[PDB]
Design a protein around this ligand. Structure first.
Ligand code: HEM
Ligand SMILES: c1ccc2[nH]cnc2c1
Length: 293
């Protein structure tokens, strides 16, 4: 038996309870849209959601979104998480408005809000994460390096229980935002539409003219004449025949991308968690436009 994480609903709360939390985030998303040269807080929040979950090991159920351990120094100060304090501070007033929601739920909810609010697919989400103690925090080094080839990525994602179709779809999240030299040692966007969820990641991947270069931190990255970039790990998605066909697939069909990403992001956010048979069914929240706001 590995360790068991049982989802316990916050006492007496429900969908229209968490629906209110969704609203505060999507609203704040519209208020501070000047963030990072008017990209907004959308992208950093989905990167934050991915990083609290991507620490998971399917072997012994350590790490993962359940415990909310990012709030702890060690995970917070992980070089792999540099720049995410930007998403933490954004979610902080929202945590004081609803101090009854667990960190784990807040971190995952914010990523879900962000994807739906940037016109992406719907992501069904579940509550029940409970805060665990400091020494539950995973050791640094569990998140992936950007400087590697196709089969590093493949092995790596096996620890997260993800197959080829799932890793190609998750990576489509890289249509969003940009890399920041002081954060990761990489600079530039992957695309033009920075804060709307589309299939541009695969398009650019297959359509631009790419060159291998060193950036100002002296690391290698792929650059296009258009002013975009790709990480070595991104560019391997077309160096590999199995990844390649799934990429071509997502560049032809953005509806398939949306469904595959939805399933893969949900799984990602829930890995390691056991839900009781009497747990409330997954919530599908309405967008701010679906509620006339
Ligand atoms: C091979 C795996 C991955 C690697 C190596 C990787 C690496 C990176 C790096 C280096 C950045 C730049 C951060 C910065 O400079 O500030 C970044 C940004 C981002 N990544 Fe990933 N990533 C990976 C997979 C994913 C996944 C699975 C997701 C979500 C599903 C994701 C979502 C993002 C987002 C949204 C950003 C934008 C952050 C922002 O705009 O501030 N990435 N990624
Ligand atoms: C958002 C803001 C502050 C927090 N403290 C612990 N978890 C948090 C989430």
């Amino acid at each position: 038996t590995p360790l068991v994480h049982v989802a316990s609903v916050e006492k007496g709360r429900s969908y229209e309870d968490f629906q209110k939390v969704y609203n505060a985030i999507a609203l704040k998303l519209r208020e501070d849209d000047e963030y990072d040269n008017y990209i907004g807080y959308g992208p950093v929040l989905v990167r934050l959601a991915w990083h609290t979950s991507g620490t998971w090991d399917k072997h012994d159920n350590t790490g993962g979104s359940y415990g909310g351990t990012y709030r702890f120094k060690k995970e917070f100060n992980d070089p792999s998480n540099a720049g995410l304090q930007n998403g933490f501070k954004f979610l902080e007033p929202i945590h004081k408005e609803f101090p009854w929601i667990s960190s784990g739920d807040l971190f995952s909810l914010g990523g879900v809000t962000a994807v739906q609010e940037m016109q992406g697919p719907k992501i069904p989400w579940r509550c029940g994460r409970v805060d665990t103690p400091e020494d539950t925090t995973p050791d640094n080094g569990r998140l992936p390096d950007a400087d590697k080839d196709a089969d590093y990525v493949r092995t790596f994602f096996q620890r997260l229980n993800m197959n080829d179709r799932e890793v190609v779809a998750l990576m489509g999240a890289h249509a969003l935002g940009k890399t920041h030299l002081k954060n990761s040692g990489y600079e530039g966007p992957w695309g033009a539409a920075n804060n709307v969820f589309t299939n541009e990641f695969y398009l650019n991947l297959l359509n631009e003219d790419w060159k291998l270069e060193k950036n100002d931190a002296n690391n290698e990255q792929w650059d296009s004449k258009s002013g975009y970039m790709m990480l070595p790990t991104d560019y391997s998605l077309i160096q590999d025949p199995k990844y390649l066909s799934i990429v071509k697939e997502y560049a032809n069909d953005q509806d398939k991308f949306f469904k595959d990403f939805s399933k893969a992001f949900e799984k990602l956010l829930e890995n390691g968690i056991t839900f009781p048979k009497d747990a409330p069914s997954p919530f599908i929240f309405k967008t701010l436009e679906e509620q006339g706001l």
